[model samples]
Target: KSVVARVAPAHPEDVGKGIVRMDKYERQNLGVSVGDYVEVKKAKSVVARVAPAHPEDVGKGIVRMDKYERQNLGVSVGDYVEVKKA
Candidate 1:
């Protein structure tokens, strides 16, 4: 099953806090707690296995996959993915 979430901006002053400011809906939908394994799919292919959602890397924030990688694997936020047993 898939859930919808919004990409919220982290507070500029709060960088490195490990908590990005998200709307209620986004927070509820992206309910991927720590340690949960998730599969990210783009188009129809599984791209990356990600641990439960967490604050992005301190200052640099989240590192996104490259275009070619995303194109090949077919993944994006909000895409339906199968969470495999870890």
Candidate 2:
């Protein structure tokens, strides 16, 4: 199973780290946690490290991706993407 959420740009501090940020609630639903591998997909798929998103985004169904991550999955901000535990 997987979780689906809108993509957002990674926090400035998180760029280039190859990490994707998701709400804790999303993580729980996806059966993943920080430092875990996850499969992020649009048309293509890529593996990324997971991290908890900003507290303000909790339960908001958003996932933050770095520029490279978005490109890898052929996605952009506001696109829906599926995330599954890898």
Candidate 3:
């Protein structure tokens, strides 16, 4: 049930039908569900599956992701990203 695929500039993990983990704040801010798809906007856009993350994982106006997916969006740690319904 992959809404999208991760190719180059993706993190070093198995991306086969995977979901993106985001902080509680981010999830609430974006009004996303645990098993929903959210559009992650940065330098690029990716319709990623969603999951709940630890409170400390992401800060305000930010989300956390694997190294490869981070690079996929052309963003780095601490970078501000936009999230919305897919």
Candidate 4:
């Protein structure tokens, strides 16, 4: 299954890291495990590895991603993106 999520900027340490972070529940719903590849879609699509988000971000339908990954998908923070297992 796939889900639509709001895009959020990655943490400073995660910038340019080529990975996206989501809650564990979100990952499960996408059928992806941590470190697995996922396809993110906007005007274009980008394949990125998925990781677990911070504890406080759990249960939130938002995805944190690096600017590079965001550009690859032609998206920006606050925009929505479709995500699915790759």
Which numbered prediction scores highest in lDDT against the true structure? 2
lDDT (tens digit, per residue) of candidate 2 on 1-86 = 79899999998899799998888789899888799999998888999999888988887899989999888787878999989999
lDDT of 1 by residue, 41-83 (tens): 4345343323222345333223233334344555453333333
Model 2 C-alpha lDDT versus the unseen true structure: 0.89
lDDT of each: 0.36, 0.89, 0.60, 0.88
The digit string of per-residue lDDT tens for model 3 on 1-86 reads 11222222223453544567766655676677788888877768877787666455445333446665666678756556677778
Error of 2 at 57 (Å): 1.0
Better of 2 and 3 by TM-score: 2
TM-score of 2: 0.94
Model 2 worst lDDT window (10 residues): 69-78
Candidate structures ordered by TM-score, highest first: 2, 4, 3, 1
Q: How many residue pairs clash in each candidate?
A: 4, 0, 3, 0
Q: What is the C-alpha local distance difference test score of candidate 3?
A: 0.60
lDDT of 1: 0.36
If scored against the real structure, what TM-score would every candidate get?
A: 0.31, 0.94, 0.64, 0.92
Off by over 4 Å in 3: 1-17, 58-62
RMSD of each: 8.8, 0.9, 6.8, 1.0
- N/CA/C clash count, model 4: 0
